[PDB]
Design a protein around this ligand. Sequence first.
Ligand SMILES: CCCCCCCC
Ligand SMILES: CCCCCCCC
Ligand SMILES: [K+]
Ligand SMILES: [K+]
Ligand SMILES: [K+]
Ligand SMILES: [K+]
Ligand SMILES: [K+]
Lengths: 257, 257
Amino acid sequence: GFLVLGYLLYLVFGAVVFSSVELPYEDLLRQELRKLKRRFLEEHECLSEPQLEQFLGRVLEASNYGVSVLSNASGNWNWDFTSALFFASTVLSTTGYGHTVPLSDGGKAFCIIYSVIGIPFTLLFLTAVVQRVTVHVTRRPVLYFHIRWGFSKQVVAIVHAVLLGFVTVSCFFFIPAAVFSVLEDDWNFLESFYFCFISLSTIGLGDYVPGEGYNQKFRELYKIGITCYLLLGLIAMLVVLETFCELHELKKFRKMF
Amino acid sequence: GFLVLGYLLYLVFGAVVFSSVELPYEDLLRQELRKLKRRFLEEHECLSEPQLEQFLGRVLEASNYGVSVLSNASGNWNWDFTSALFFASTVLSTTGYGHTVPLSDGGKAFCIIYSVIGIPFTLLFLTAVVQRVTVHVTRRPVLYFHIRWGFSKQVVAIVHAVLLGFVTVSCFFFIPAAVFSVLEDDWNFLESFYFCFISLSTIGLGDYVPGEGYNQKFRELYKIGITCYLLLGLIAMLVVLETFCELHELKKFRKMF
Ligand SMILES: CCCCCCCC
Ligand SMILES: CCCCCCCC
Ligand SMILES: [K+]
Ligand SMILES: [K+]
Ligand SMILES: [K+]
Ligand SMILES: [K+]
Ligand SMILES: [K+]
């Protein structure tokens, strides 16, 4: 009741603030992309608006569908054992970057069937893998702290679980942000941090995707390393979110609302 | 151990089957989109490959970033109270269609901050709303069945919870698939079912997004109706997935693996 109105109010607060900050930039880019439309068309006097409209209709449909028209088309194979292993990790993990999606009626039908049983199986996989890590990285330090210093078990967990999140946050955001800032030359640090947040959070917006380097040296090892990092981030934030959910303070908030 | 290998094996099985079915179609489309590249370039002899490569570099970057270059650019406002309410519902619900994402350094920074506290708050919202529905749609019929027929409570829940999923599945897939097949003229039934599965599942691939009708009559009421349907689907599949997780058979599978 009260929360539902608050949630609706919260999106309303979200929509105005984005309208206050994002929309002027978007109006600027939409004004400058429309400027780009008219520069590109002005440059190519031969080229006309309607045929181009149809061409981009297909090109962007495909792009939405995954088949980037970039790299002379002979760029990276959207569907190859490694890339398909990446698509399947993302669709099973719900990230759904959108850089690769099924292109056929039959292909879509298998993806549904594959994802009806695949995703529950993958939730089982991530939950089991997450459960192991909680015993090690988070539970073990808490036990050591209480025994050495001897204060109450109830107070050590709540106060110090918060401390253990910072360790995970730095390990999986800041250091990886620097790593990604080194491997991807065309990224800054802010975009890399944004990509790491969206990927681990599972939003998978798809504006930042790794492995797009033009005929880069280690495409296969790199696609599998990024796959392993993306699961690792998912496991480590399901551990952090499990611990925050376990926290008495956050738990009370849930009970209240 | 055994599961982790199986999960890795499962993606390997996934990658080969997609390579067996999707890749020939993708090779066909990538062969025919490269054909489209060379038809479009062949038609426009004036137009040259490199400048076009740069132009599409920006156009598809923006498209990834959300600003579709379609509808003379003056199409729908990516960021307006309704559309922003939709972006915020999707990013909070993790769907992340990618049709709208932050375009600025400052905008990204707020989206992170907005989504650090927004998403946990939204998980709280969906969980609370889901919890209410379970008491009504699923729990009430089970109680009625046992009293009227008098068989054991343990056996009624497990056998008939499966029955209640079909009701939810038809209510939120088949009938909505027909509804979407009516509102979106350019869709078939299969694509609509695919869109409903990905959206409710939260994959949010973004190849199917509603509200793209060119200056359609009811853009605001329609964007908010689709928003309400997408939450409703999320609530009804978190109820179905809660009940399947509750099921003794599925629970045993989790315990086993
Ligand atoms: C503790 C098990 C880790 C498994 C990682 C798998 C990465 C592909
Ligand atoms: C039972 C509460 C339903 C609220 C739906 C809100 C849709 C925007
Ligand atoms: K997603
Ligand atoms: K996406
Ligand atoms: K996308
Ligand atoms: K998701
Ligand atoms: K997504």
